[PDB]
Design a protein around this ligand. Structure first.
Ligand SMILES: [Ca+2]
Length: 279
């Protein structure tokens, strides 16, 4: 398949080079996989989701996304126009309030929720979780992310937007998950992206067009936007049978574009997510 005039980030994850605008992908498009978006919720009624999105848990008085961030992330995972994995099922877990903040105890509960709830869903090709959130180091937050990964979910987490070493942020610093940095359309590390040895991979994170609340769309930037590209790529590759949840991060790193990015400090991987699709 070929989607012309795609968002630059989709085009980038199907290309060996910057500067193209078509997204190429296998038509299976993540069918039979599931992605949990652990964030501010998802506006499931958005037509871009085509009935494939639903809210499954909230820790607040409503399951509505009153912020937009979670809807934007879900759109990059799996919306029809803006998504990597255009046929995946999307499950929203609202651990962040409508101001975009959440207590660590609530975030931990949401991760343990996903580890159990996957047994209540039909995801024969595999289960992914996209965690576009983060704060200071907490061993409890890291151990919750580690447990989720151990349960058989591919966990993708944002490196954080502090232009600092991700070792000092959670769940970014948990070694066993897939920690995602952000790049821009000219293959530079995004100026805000955290870095360090704990990073596994970079994805597109600057000026990312996706869905928003009110049935709308907008471009925004962050490692939060890079993370759902990687989560959607994992869902896509699972459906193709190329990898499993336990192996997906290593598979993505093994098949990534190498050495493309500038401004990677020594000790941090120089790797940009790539779907290796050949039509
Ligand atoms: Ca890792």
């Amino acid at each position: 398949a070929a989607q012309t005039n795609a968002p630059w980030g989709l085009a980038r994850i199907s290309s060996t080079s910057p500067g193209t605008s078509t997204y190429y992908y296998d038509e299976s498009a993540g069918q039979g996989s599931c992605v949990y978006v652990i964030d501010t919720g998802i506006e499931a009624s958005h037509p871009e989701f085509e009935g494939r999105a639903q809210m499954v848990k909230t820790y607040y008085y409503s399951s509505r996304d009153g912020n937009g961030h979670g809807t934007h992330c879900a759109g990059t995972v799996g919306s029809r126009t803006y998504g990597v994995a255009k046929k995946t099922q999307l499950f929203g877990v609202k651990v962040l309030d409508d101001n975009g903040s959440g207590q660590y105890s609530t975030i931990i509960a949401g991760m343990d929720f996903v580890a159990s709830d996957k047994n209540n869903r039909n995801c024969p090709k595999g289960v992914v979780a996209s965690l576009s959130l983060g704060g200071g180091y907490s061993s409890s937050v890291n151990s919750a992310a580690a447990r989720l990964q151990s349960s058989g979910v591919m966990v993708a987490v944002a490196a954080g937007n502090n232009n600092a070493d991700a070792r000092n942020y959670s769940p970014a610093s948990e070694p066993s998950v897939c920690t995602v940095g952000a790049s821009d359309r000219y293959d530079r590390r995004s100026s805000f992206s955290n870095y360090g040895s704990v990073l596994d991979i970079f994805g597109p994170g600057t000026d990312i067009l996706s869905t928003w609340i009110g049935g709308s769309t907008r471009s925004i930037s962050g490692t939060s936007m890079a993370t759902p590209h990687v989560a959607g790529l994992a869902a896509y590759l699972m459906t193709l049978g190329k990898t499993t949840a336990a192996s997906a991060c290593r598979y993505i790193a093994d098949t990534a574009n190498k050495g493309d990015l500038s401004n990677i400090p020594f000790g941090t991987v120089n790797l940009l997510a790539y779907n290796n699709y050949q039509a």
